[PDB]
Amino acid sequence: MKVEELAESISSYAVGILFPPQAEAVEKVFSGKNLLLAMPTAAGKTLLAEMAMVREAIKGGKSLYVVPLRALAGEKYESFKKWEKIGLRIGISTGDYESRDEHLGDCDIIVTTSEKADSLIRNRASWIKAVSCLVVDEIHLLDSEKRGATLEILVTKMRRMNKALRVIGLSATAPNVTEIAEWLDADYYVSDWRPVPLVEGVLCEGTLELFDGAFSTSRRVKFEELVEECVAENGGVLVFESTRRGAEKTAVKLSAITAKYVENEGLEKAILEENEGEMSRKLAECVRKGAAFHHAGLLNGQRRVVEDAFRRGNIKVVVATPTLVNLPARRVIVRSLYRFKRIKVSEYKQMAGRAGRPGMDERGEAIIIVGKRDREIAVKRYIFGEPERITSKLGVETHLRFHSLSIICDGYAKTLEELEDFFADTFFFKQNEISLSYELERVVRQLENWGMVVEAAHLAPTKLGSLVSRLYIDPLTGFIFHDVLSRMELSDIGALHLICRTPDMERLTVRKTDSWVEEEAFRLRKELSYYPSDFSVEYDWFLSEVKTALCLKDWIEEKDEDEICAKYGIAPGDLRRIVETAEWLSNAMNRIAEEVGNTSVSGLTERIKHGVKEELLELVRIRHIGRVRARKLYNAGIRNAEDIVRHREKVASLIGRGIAERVVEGISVKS
């Protein structure tokens, strides 16, 4: 079997109209052994993995492509539909935890996220045991203080479950990537190869020094011009700023330039299609003039609209933040080098690594605009310089606690010893051979104290623990709930506040101006699950909890979004992010509540989800009608599904003929 041949033939069919020079890569991909691929651009890295899967499929196996963000999940998912021409059946699962998703079980490639995978495992999906090859994309994220831990545990749990499991890790370039390969028992393959070469250049006092390997080409140019230059050519310029305010500020100036080239007026409406005012205002017209800014503030809608547009060219410039998703662009400017501390070689490398514009450009330009703080650092360390070494973060108590509970429940470790053994098979161990027996002992006790783990001369989970496990929430969270609930029984704000006490919840920042919070917090005292000293150290952590719960409150009290935003000083995307989260825990808190018997939270989740009152719940369940429409309809006779039908003409007068039509189309088909 001349593997090179197969690989080629296979790719072409599906793709047709791109991956490493020498055999090694392909040679290994088809070997069947665990394999770690370390390359810069995700480009060739992914097709090798894909082939890996295509092959495994034909062998009659099943692959589970894992990704870190729920975002990529979709991107990769679609990307794999390409192999449908060959009869592979792709499937995806994201966001649903308490479910085994048994329908995926008959897919050849199942894309999901690290967490979702871990969950599916805790929730004992039946297909997992069928997965023969696990591909861990962006495995270098093993260094991620947030992500790492799950990766280490997922991989381990999975390996320990199936010795025949073939793990394929895909990572960015880093020095210790080989030890990863060792921890994975895999043939590695490393390379600096890039489809479209990259030129990294720094820009100082009017001069741009482009580095082509060992040479250089100084020139006199100005930022505004570098942008227009490529913009002029329509190669796409991607600028990076370390702020939300900064990204928007610049995303504006450039619109001046991008304006005289394109006038996207239909897309200006595409933005406002969901929100308006201050922020969305800016992005909207900004886009009308070619430019745009991309940050966590926008809504997943406004984002994908700006992304799709920059891809097609409608948008000439996209000013984002390190928070950044495939954005093809010829030029890539990096405004600052510090993170208002300094940016990691990694972040820069990644940022620069977007300059390639495969199949449209010959080279990629990435410029680090630096001042004069001895610009040598931007050259000596960033341009020419190794990225930071991947260091495992599973060590923290947090993660330990979080995962141990899972391990002791799912039946991997039945004694403290074998719990210690489990963590020994970790990348954390392989990396620093440290016995965590101490802390790990502390954990299991605390897990016992919290009533989640029981010591009957054998470690086992309690009904509660199994729950906390399946809910995939921090056991501390599960405790705060089970404790407070089993004892008292709060109200709206009281419950919204309880959630915000939880570590799993996001909180807002309290500005010097948010004075009401402190007052409101007092008035509402006696209602909250606890109340700190006016000058206790936690009065600040407290006030955030309140301000956050107050926010959810307004959301739940149907307050205008833009209004809620302005009030709390956050952006629509944030609000959506917070509510989104708040709900998940809200569900968690309720299921926990039930187990104890408390009910003061019974119909909270629903409210949180739609941000409606309670009287509108019946209306919002209909194909989701939204707070706005639901209110209008409720302010009239239409107060449920039935009434929307019987008074059709009326409905359409309130909501709209179009929307009206769509809404009814669903109800009848059901009832």
XYZ file of C-alpha atoms in Angstrom:
671
model
C 0.000 0.000 0.000
C 1.660 3.161 -1.293
C -0.001 5.412 1.290
C 0.911 8.677 -0.454
C -1.213 7.591 -3.435
C -4.297 6.765 -1.385
C -4.117 9.938 0.656
C -3.957 12.036 -2.503
C -6.748 10.255 -4.353
C -8.907 10.370 -1.245
C -8.468 14.083 -0.538
C -9.007 15.195 -4.146
C -12.336 13.370 -4.353
C -13.921 15.160 -1.390
C -12.007 18.442 -1.692
C -10.875 18.522 -5.297
C -11.157 22.282 -5.774
C -2.688 21.529 0.740
C -0.913 19.210 3.203
C 2.773 18.422 4.160
C 5.585 17.779 1.596
C 7.032 14.427 2.638
C 5.473 11.045 3.374
C 6.157 10.977 7.122
C 2.886 12.794 7.825
C 0.678 10.581 5.669
C 2.840 7.577 6.428
C 1.998 8.011 10.129
C -1.593 9.157 9.770
C -2.282 5.777 8.158
C -0.105 3.842 10.623
C -2.860 3.411 13.193
C -0.640 4.352 16.087
C -1.325 7.279 18.421
C -0.017 10.333 16.677
C 0.671 13.908 17.585
C 0.835 16.449 14.818
C 2.380 19.783 15.642
C 2.098 22.386 12.897
C 1.470 26.170 12.847
C -1.586 26.867 10.724
C -4.548 24.602 11.397
C -4.517 24.133 7.610
C -2.660 20.896 6.778
C -3.056 19.733 10.346
C -6.794 19.188 9.866
C -6.787 17.374 6.517
C -4.331 14.812 7.901
C -6.647 14.279 10.845
C -9.612 14.085 8.491
C -7.906 11.431 6.401
C -7.062 9.742 9.655
C -10.800 9.606 10.282
C -11.807 8.686 6.734
C -9.491 5.721 7.041
C -10.671 4.696 10.510
C -14.228 4.862 9.158
C -13.480 2.557 6.238
C -11.863 0.158 8.720
C -15.274 0.208 10.340
C -14.338 2.363 13.287
C -15.677 5.623 14.713
C -13.931 8.943 15.360
C -14.783 11.594 17.925
C -13.248 14.914 16.904
C -12.971 17.079 19.987
C -12.685 20.836 20.016
C -12.357 23.415 22.827
C -14.921 26.095 21.836
C -18.556 25.500 20.916
C -17.794 27.900 18.025
C -15.237 25.756 16.149
C -17.490 22.765 16.699
C -19.844 24.048 14.031
C -17.062 25.218 11.738
C -15.377 21.818 11.831
C -18.710 20.053 11.632
C -19.669 21.674 8.383
C -16.096 21.194 7.185
C -16.436 17.445 7.573
C -19.689 17.219 5.630
C -17.269 17.186 2.741
C -16.760 13.446 3.323
C -20.400 12.701 2.734
C -19.509 12.012 -0.915
C -17.727 8.974 0.500
C -20.586 7.862 2.705
C -19.234 9.086 6.020
C -22.021 10.378 8.201
C -21.044 13.426 10.261
C -22.833 14.404 13.460
C -22.416 17.102 16.092
C -23.495 17.713 19.666
C -23.080 20.909 21.644
C -24.717 22.420 24.722
C -26.897 19.571 25.931
C -25.420 17.922 29.009
C -28.017 15.681 30.679
C -28.467 13.568 27.537
C -26.712 10.568 26.001
C -27.357 11.778 22.442
C -27.799 8.165 21.317
C -28.656 9.404 17.809
C -25.037 10.405 17.154
C -24.136 6.778 17.854
C -24.508 6.063 14.170
C -22.154 8.690 12.825
C -18.624 8.125 11.554
C -17.283 11.420 12.813
C -18.853 13.087 15.859
C -17.662 16.648 16.493
C -18.279 18.134 19.964
C -16.315 19.935 22.628
C -13.990 18.637 25.331
C -16.587 19.340 27.996
C -19.453 17.877 26.021
C -17.372 14.742 25.534
C -16.517 14.514 29.212
C -20.207 14.982 29.952
C -21.369 12.393 27.427
C -18.994 10.081 29.290
C -20.326 10.917 32.754
C -23.835 10.519 31.344
C -22.811 7.108 30.057
C -23.679 7.585 26.370
C -23.710 4.154 24.788
C -21.813 5.126 21.654
C -18.708 6.311 23.441
C -17.733 2.689 24.002
C -17.868 2.438 20.224
C -15.452 5.304 19.562
C -12.209 3.807 18.241
C -10.267 6.949 17.433
C -10.248 10.162 19.442
C -8.845 13.240 17.775
C -7.979 16.079 20.151
C -7.746 19.302 18.203
C -5.819 22.246 19.646
C -4.196 19.966 22.181
C -1.575 22.605 22.937
C -4.429 24.180 24.915
C -3.230 21.676 27.517
C -1.401 24.713 28.786
C -4.727 26.489 29.229
C -5.526 27.319 32.855
C -9.202 27.047 31.905
C -9.213 24.308 29.311
C -6.205 22.089 29.991
C -7.584 20.057 32.915
C -10.557 18.645 30.968
C -8.291 17.652 28.118
C -5.998 15.716 30.448
C -8.938 14.025 32.170
C -10.983 13.355 29.013
C -8.062 11.699 27.277
C -7.205 9.684 30.363
C -10.764 8.515 31.135
C -11.165 7.538 27.480
C -7.850 5.750 27.231
C -8.404 3.899 30.487
C -11.724 2.796 29.062
C -10.444 1.478 25.758
C -6.864 0.225 25.420
C -7.486 -0.132 21.677
C -8.423 3.557 21.479
C -6.234 5.480 19.007
C -5.533 8.993 20.164
C -4.488 11.658 17.630
C -3.519 15.007 19.091
C -3.239 18.120 16.893
C -1.346 21.104 18.228
C 0.292 24.393 17.391
C 4.075 24.582 17.361
C 5.713 24.502 20.762
C 8.988 23.123 22.171
C 7.749 20.391 24.506
C 5.129 19.044 22.095
C 7.215 15.884 22.053
C 6.630 15.125 25.732
C 2.917 15.416 24.936
C 3.442 12.771 22.295
C 5.119 10.723 24.987
C 2.265 11.156 27.437
C 0.106 10.019 24.489
C 2.453 7.194 23.427
C 2.427 8.561 19.899
C 4.645 9.066 16.897
C 4.894 12.777 16.586
C 5.383 14.787 13.433
C 6.456 18.380 13.665
C 6.902 21.010 10.979
C 7.003 24.745 10.289
C 5.465 24.075 6.917
C 2.776 26.475 5.782
C 0.783 26.358 2.524
C 1.212 30.086 2.015
C 4.540 31.381 3.383
C 4.498 34.087 6.083
C 6.572 37.259 6.408
C 6.781 38.810 9.865
C 7.603 42.481 10.092
C 7.742 45.131 12.800
C 6.672 48.745 12.176
C 8.642 51.493 13.927
C 8.760 55.285 13.474
C 7.523 55.283 9.889
C 9.629 52.232 8.991
C 8.401 48.704 8.238
C 11.082 46.013 8.342
C 9.770 42.862 6.659
C 11.675 39.691 7.492
C 11.931 37.071 4.748
C 13.747 34.342 6.628
C 17.282 35.664 7.025
C 16.907 38.907 5.079
C 15.019 42.191 5.555
C 13.442 45.072 3.611
C 13.042 48.375 5.465
C 10.693 50.977 4.015
C 8.879 54.159 4.995
C 5.137 53.606 5.507
C 2.270 54.595 7.805
C -0.343 52.407 9.508
C -3.299 53.986 7.741
C -1.534 53.183 4.477
C -0.646 49.556 5.259
C -4.359 49.061 5.755
C -5.458 50.782 2.576
C -2.664 49.087 0.632
C -4.127 45.598 1.107
C -7.663 46.983 1.431
C -7.040 48.569 -1.942
C -6.124 45.127 -3.262
C -9.004 43.512 -1.330
C -6.741 40.956 0.325
C -8.277 41.638 3.703
C -6.565 43.357 6.603
C -7.121 42.021 10.116
C -6.114 44.345 12.964
C -5.657 43.314 16.593
C -6.189 45.556 19.626
C -6.068 44.666 23.334
C -9.318 46.371 24.229
C -12.979 46.579 23.395
C -12.979 50.376 23.298
C -9.783 50.406 21.267
C -11.013 47.914 18.718
C -14.230 49.870 18.127
C -12.395 53.220 18.058
C -10.078 51.993 15.293
C -12.720 49.904 13.556
C -14.273 53.337 12.995
C -11.342 55.396 11.640
C -10.686 52.690 9.071
C -14.307 52.747 7.984
C -13.425 56.134 6.512
C -11.058 54.317 4.152
C -13.045 51.107 3.659
C -16.022 53.357 2.920
C -14.753 54.836 -0.366
C -14.261 51.278 -1.621
C -17.514 49.530 -0.722
C -20.961 50.545 0.471
C -22.668 47.638 2.212
C -26.108 49.062 2.912
C -28.007 45.775 2.960
C -25.615 44.456 5.586
C -26.090 47.587 7.691
C -29.638 46.309 8.129
C -28.344 42.781 8.803
C -26.686 44.034 11.970
C -29.594 45.977 13.435
C -31.819 42.998 12.565
C -31.569 42.086 16.255
C -30.313 44.984 18.374
C -29.890 48.754 17.996
C -28.446 51.687 19.900
C -24.964 52.773 20.980
C -22.870 49.647 20.221
C -24.847 47.848 17.497
C -25.309 51.375 16.177
C -21.574 51.748 15.626
C -20.927 48.267 14.213
C -23.921 48.647 11.901
C -22.866 51.763 9.984
C -19.206 50.797 10.429
C -19.961 47.751 8.303
C -21.979 49.841 5.861
C -18.611 51.381 5.132
C -16.556 48.185 4.756
C -14.893 48.191 8.227
C -16.057 46.463 11.445
C -14.974 45.421 14.952
C -15.260 41.899 16.365
C -15.448 41.282 20.110
C -17.391 39.460 22.821
C -19.721 42.423 22.986
C -21.510 41.645 19.726
C -24.111 38.890 19.489
C -23.277 35.574 17.877
C -25.425 36.918 15.073
C -23.628 40.199 14.517
C -20.407 38.210 14.699
C -21.185 35.605 12.070
C -22.522 38.414 9.893
C -19.234 40.309 10.130
C -17.278 37.091 9.694
C -19.157 35.931 6.569
C -18.810 39.450 5.138
C -15.071 39.756 5.726
C -14.731 36.393 4.016
C -16.583 37.520 0.905
C -14.809 40.874 0.827
C -17.889 43.002 1.495
C -15.965 43.884 4.629
C -12.431 45.112 4.017
C -11.204 45.422 7.599
C -11.962 43.669 10.880
C -10.558 45.073 14.117
C -10.702 42.375 16.798
C -9.144 41.522 20.156
C -6.990 38.563 21.330
C -10.306 36.924 22.286
C -10.440 35.897 18.662
C -12.665 31.557 14.283
C -11.567 31.439 10.674
C -10.834 34.921 9.307
C -8.846 34.746 6.049
C -6.771 37.817 5.347
C -3.709 38.876 3.397
C -2.499 41.520 5.829
C -2.650 41.206 9.620
C -1.699 44.192 11.746
C -1.093 43.848 15.471
C -1.463 47.273 17.064
C 0.006 46.724 20.515
C 2.198 44.101 22.100
C 1.008 44.409 25.698
C -2.244 43.248 27.280
C -3.664 46.262 29.150
C 2.159 42.296 31.428
C 2.684 41.512 27.744
C 1.257 39.247 25.039
C 2.662 35.706 24.896
C 4.766 34.605 21.922
C 1.880 32.194 21.464
C -0.854 34.825 21.080
C 1.305 36.807 18.667
C 2.265 33.702 16.709
C -1.369 32.748 16.423
C -2.325 36.289 15.392
C 0.419 36.424 12.814
C -0.451 32.897 11.689
C -3.576 34.288 10.043
C -1.664 36.256 7.393
C -1.703 33.317 5.004
C -4.614 33.614 2.531
C -4.391 30.105 0.941
C -5.473 29.978 -2.664
C -5.606 33.724 -3.151
C -2.283 35.078 -1.915
C 1.396 34.291 -2.368
C 2.794 35.071 1.115
C 1.227 36.626 4.166
C 2.232 39.836 5.883
C 1.986 40.172 9.675
C 3.108 43.454 11.237
C 3.772 44.136 14.909
C 3.409 47.889 15.352
C 5.763 48.787 18.176
C 6.831 52.115 19.626
C 10.453 52.385 20.726
C 10.793 50.602 24.064
C 13.859 48.932 22.561
C 11.886 47.404 19.652
C 14.440 44.574 19.828
C 12.035 42.602 22.057
C 9.351 42.503 19.354
C 12.019 41.148 17.019
C 14.337 39.194 19.290
C 11.457 37.492 21.106
C 8.256 37.692 19.067
C 9.249 37.683 15.389
C 12.300 35.444 15.874
C 11.526 33.593 19.059
C 10.221 30.307 20.406
C 6.708 30.188 21.895
C 6.173 29.394 25.558
C 6.487 25.794 26.683
C 3.217 23.901 27.289
C 2.813 23.511 31.035
C -0.018 21.414 32.514
C -2.455 23.148 34.849
C -4.480 20.221 36.291
C -2.682 20.917 39.585
C -5.026 23.524 41.128
C -7.420 22.340 43.850
C -10.400 23.540 41.801
C -9.935 21.164 38.873
C -8.849 18.393 41.198
C -12.106 18.653 43.098
C -14.156 19.064 39.943
C -12.753 15.988 38.263
C -12.229 13.731 41.289
C -15.968 13.811 41.991
C -16.481 12.676 38.409
C -13.840 9.982 38.665
C -15.173 8.579 41.930
C -18.711 8.557 40.483
C -18.136 7.167 37.037
C -16.389 4.203 38.614
C -12.759 4.783 37.682
C -11.324 5.174 41.169
C -12.918 3.283 44.047
C -10.245 3.992 46.673
C -8.033 6.977 47.414
C -5.105 4.946 46.084
C -6.629 4.352 42.639
C -7.775 7.954 42.590
C -4.122 8.843 43.045
C -3.266 6.314 40.350
C -5.736 7.885 37.961
C -4.137 11.317 38.254
C -0.798 9.640 37.796
C -1.708 8.796 34.170
C -2.183 12.509 33.638
C -0.109 14.828 31.489
C 0.380 16.692 34.746
C 2.169 13.705 36.217
C 4.232 12.893 33.120
C 5.283 16.509 33.243
C 6.199 17.009 36.917
C 5.828 13.574 38.589
C 4.178 14.998 41.693
C 2.079 12.911 44.015
C -1.099 14.831 44.734
C -2.062 12.315 47.412
C -2.043 15.143 49.929
C -4.485 17.546 48.286
C -6.316 14.683 46.637
C -6.976 13.438 50.170
C -8.233 16.873 51.193
C -10.585 16.773 48.206
C -12.219 13.408 48.861
C -12.814 14.441 52.474
C -14.456 17.725 51.465
C -16.415 15.791 48.853
C -17.515 13.525 51.693
C -18.312 16.449 53.964
C -20.475 17.957 51.245
C -22.318 14.645 51.248
C -21.426 13.797 47.662
C -18.964 10.985 48.392
C -19.350 8.254 51.030
C -16.612 6.162 52.659
C -17.935 2.634 53.248
C -14.372 1.182 53.349
C -14.848 1.867 49.611
C -15.423 5.274 47.967
C -18.790 5.722 46.287
C -21.073 8.550 45.140
C -24.276 9.659 46.856
C -27.459 10.348 44.874
C -26.489 14.021 45.173
C -22.944 13.488 43.948
C -24.141 11.541 40.921
C -26.408 14.492 40.243
C -23.738 17.141 40.700
C -21.652 14.935 38.405
C -24.227 14.627 35.606
C -25.099 18.323 35.834
C -21.438 19.052 35.063
C -21.269 21.899 37.568
C -18.588 22.622 40.109
C -19.321 20.481 43.167
C -18.843 23.615 45.263
C -21.715 25.053 43.208
C -23.778 21.953 43.839
C -23.071 22.410 47.499
C -23.996 26.078 47.757
C -27.295 25.013 46.202
C -28.013 21.869 48.171
C -26.981 23.612 51.399
C -28.918 26.876 51.136
C -31.961 25.141 49.620
C -32.210 22.230 52.032
C -32.197 24.866 54.774
C -34.230 27.881 53.660
C -36.223 28.771 50.593
C -35.625 31.946 48.641
C -37.475 34.235 46.272
C -36.755 35.518 42.770
C -33.894 37.833 43.681
C -33.030 35.481 46.505
C -32.577 32.676 44.018
C -30.974 34.767 41.320
C -28.547 35.849 44.010
C -27.859 32.232 45.111
C -26.799 31.410 41.549
C -24.454 34.404 41.518
C -22.871 33.045 44.674
C -21.927 29.931 42.753
C -18.403 29.754 41.244
C -19.801 28.488 37.919
C -21.611 31.754 37.357
C -20.268 34.832 35.656
C -20.520 38.102 37.541
C -20.401 41.744 36.602
C -17.879 44.319 37.687
C -18.974 46.936 40.179
C -18.027 50.459 39.065
C -17.510 53.378 41.451
C -20.830 54.676 40.096
C -22.895 51.556 40.821
C -23.826 52.925 44.246
C -27.404 51.698 44.214
C -26.119 48.150 44.354
C -24.962 48.637 47.944
C -28.249 50.292 48.959
C -30.470 47.880 47.061
C -28.429 45.062 48.566
C -29.298 46.259 52.056
C -33.019 46.708 51.406
C -33.013 43.248 49.868
C -31.064 41.826 52.796
C -33.132 39.359 54.832
C -33.989 37.992 51.401
C -30.513 36.812 50.271
C -28.998 33.486 51.422
C -26.375 35.407 53.422
C -25.277 38.923 54.335
C -21.625 40.070 54.936
C -20.298 42.914 57.077
C -20.498 46.395 55.616
C -16.695 46.358 55.770
C -15.912 42.663 55.560
C -13.328 41.708 52.927
C -16.002 39.966 50.854
C -18.294 42.996 50.633
C -16.964 43.500 47.124
C -17.370 39.907 45.978
C -20.831 40.308 47.501
C -21.826 43.503 45.702
C -20.919 41.881 42.356
C -23.160 38.935 43.208
C -25.995 41.369 43.860
C -25.418 43.613 40.860
C -25.403 40.441 38.770
C -28.594 39.105 40.270
C -30.207 42.490 39.922
C -29.300 42.305 36.247
C -30.937 38.913 35.817
C -33.882 40.412 37.697
C -34.454 43.208 35.172
C -33.984 40.613 32.438
C -36.679 38.569 34.168
C -38.777 41.700 34.728
C -38.941 42.254 30.983
C -36.835 45.409 31.085
C -35.649 46.681 27.666
C -32.381 44.930 26.744
C -30.567 48.082 25.609
C -31.805 49.528 28.880
C -30.486 46.602 30.950
C -27.201 46.972 29.074
C -26.856 50.679 29.629
C -27.809 50.246 33.283
C -25.194 47.608 34.015
C -22.602 48.937 31.588
C -22.309 45.763 29.551
C -22.847 44.856 25.904
C -25.689 42.789 24.398
C -23.403 39.824 23.852
C -22.421 39.917 27.504
C -26.038 40.091 28.599
C -26.864 37.140 26.375
C -23.799 35.331 27.712
C -24.784 35.935 31.321
C -28.439 35.018 30.916
C -27.363 31.984 28.940
C -25.179 30.830 31.824
C -27.504 31.912 34.600
C -30.121 29.652 33.046
C -27.904 26.542 32.956
C -27.137 26.885 36.651
C -30.781 27.828 37.209
C -31.731 24.440 35.872
C -28.992 22.825 37.993
C -30.180 24.634 41.104
C -33.742 23.519 40.504
C -32.956 19.848 39.968
C -30.882 19.976 43.136
C -33.702 21.781 44.924
C -36.146 19.078 43.930
C -33.921 16.337 45.290
C -34.217 18.002 48.652
C -37.848 19.058 48.327
C -37.533 22.845 48.194
C -39.635 24.448 45.407
C -39.177 28.217 45.787
C -37.360 28.076 42.453
C -39.816 25.888 40.506
C -40.486 28.228 37.581
C -37.346 30.360 37.549
C -35.306 28.714 34.797
C -38.044 29.262 32.213
C -38.219 32.951 33.079
C -34.456 33.325 32.916
C -34.395 31.700 29.502
C -36.892 33.970 27.783
C -36.498 36.910 30.150
C -40.277 37.093 30.537
C -42.632 37.398 33.475
C -44.570 34.170 34.142
C -47.813 35.087 32.588
C -45.882 35.157 29.286
C -44.417 31.674 29.743
C -47.255 30.064 27.817
C -46.637 32.442 24.939
C -42.824 32.215 24.766
C -42.882 28.434 24.461
C -44.448 28.853 21.029
C -41.591 28.547 18.552
C -40.123 31.022 21.042
C -42.037 34.277 20.499
C -39.794 36.503 22.528
C -40.432 38.914 25.330
C -41.387 41.725 22.970
C -43.980 39.872 20.880
C -45.161 37.896 23.904
C -45.908 41.141 25.801
C -47.784 42.770 22.894
C -49.864 39.617 22.470
C -50.459 39.401 26.198
C -51.351 43.033 26.457
C -54.165 42.006 24.173
C -56.470 39.016 24.376
C -53.917 36.645 22.850
C -52.479 35.133 25.983
C -51.565 31.663 24.845
C -51.270 29.424 21.816
C -55.015 28.857 21.423
C -55.860 32.568 21.312
C -53.118 33.246 18.760
C -54.985 30.934 16.426
C -58.623 31.980 16.963
C -57.739 35.672 16.478
C -55.261 35.346 13.619
C -55.926 38.650 11.836
C -55.468 40.441 15.160
C -52.159 38.710 15.894
C -50.720 39.764 12.534
C -51.740 43.344 13.278
C -49.694 43.285 16.478
C -46.625 41.231 15.578
C -46.712 41.324 11.797
C -48.284 39.532 8.835
C -45.064 37.711 8.063
C -44.089 36.702 11.578
C -47.776 36.055 12.250
C -47.907 33.553 9.427
C -44.724 31.758 10.529
C -45.921 31.468 14.148
C -49.251 29.847 13.339
C -47.546 27.498 10.899
C -46.045 25.667 13.872
C -48.855 25.478 16.432
C -51.489 23.669 14.357
C -49.043 21.082 12.959
C -48.447 20.152 16.607
C -51.836 20.312 18.367
